[PDB]
Amino acid sequence: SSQIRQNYSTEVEAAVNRLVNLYLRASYTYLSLGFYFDRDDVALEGVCAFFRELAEEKREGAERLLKMQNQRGGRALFQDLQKPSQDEWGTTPDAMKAAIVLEKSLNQALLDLHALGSAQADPHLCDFLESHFLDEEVKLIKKMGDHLTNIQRLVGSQAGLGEYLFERLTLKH
C-alpha cells in the first residue's frame, strides 16, 4: 500500500522497474569487462579501471531509480539479471565499441521512458530523467566516442603498441 502515490501510472512504475534491470545488467557487463582487462594475459590496468568505474556508475543509476520509485509510492520489483553477452571481450577497441552500444541502449531506454511519462502527463518523472540521466549519458557517450576515435587512430598500423600507448597516456590519468 501507499499513502503518497499521486499522478504515478502503473505504466511508468513498470517501466522504471525495467530500467532498473537494464542499469543493473549494464553494471554487471562492466564488472565482467573490468575483470577481463585484469587477466594476466590481457593486463591493461587503465582499461580495467575505466570499466570498473562504469560498473559503479550504472549501479548508482539503478539505485537512484529505486529511490525515485519509492519516493513516488511505486514498488520495486526485481528480475533475474542476465549474464553479460560475452565471457571474453577482445581488444580495447572491441570493448569500447561494446560499451558505446550498451550506453546507446540505456539512452534509448531513457528516451522511451521520458516519452512514456510525457504521454502520462508526469512532469516529475521527466524532470528526474533530465536531471541525472539524459545529460550524463550524452557526456559519457561523447567521451567513449572520443576514446574510440583515438584507439582507432592508434591501432591502424601497430596494434599492440597503440593499445599500450592509449592505456598509458589516455586511460592512466
**Residues 131-170 contacting a second copy, CB under 8 A:** 134-135, 138-139, 141-142, 144-150, 152-154, 156-158, 160-166, 168-170
Is the Cβ of residue 61 or residue 162 nearer to a second copy in the bound state? 162
Can you tell me the distance from the alpha carbon of 112 to that of 16, in angstroms, rounded to the nearest whole number? 11
Q: Are 153 and 137 in contact (CB under 8 A)?
A: no
Sign of the four-CA dihedral 147, 101, 130, 51? negative
Among 26, 31, 99, 171, binds a second copy (CB under 8 A): 31
Instruction: Work out which of 26, 62, 126, 144 binds Ru ion, going by CB under 5 A.
Output: 126
Residue 84 DSSP symbol: P
Residue 34's CB: how many other CB atoms inside 10 A?
Answer: 21
The reply on whether position 96 binds Ru ion by CB under 5 A is no
Contact 105, 22 (CB under 8 A): yes
Residues in 59-118 at the binding interface with a second copy, rule: CB under 8 A: 63, 66-67, 69-73, 75-84, 87, 100, 104, 107-108, 111, 114-115
How many other CB atoms are found less than 10 A from the CB of residue 160?
Answer: 9
Determine if residue 53 is labeled as part of a ligand binding site. Answer: yes
Query: Binding to a second copy by residue 30, rule CB under 8 A?
Result: no
**Binding residue per annotation — 60?**
yes
CB-CB neighbours of 108 under 10 Å: 11
Q: Contact at 8 Å (CB) between 140 and 103?
A: yes
41 binds, among Ru ion, a second copy, none (CB under 5 to 8 A by kind): a second copy
| Residue 56 marked as a ligand binder | yes
| Binding-site entries for Fe cation | 53, 56-57, 60, 63
Q: Which residues bind Ru ion (CB under 5 A)?
A: 126
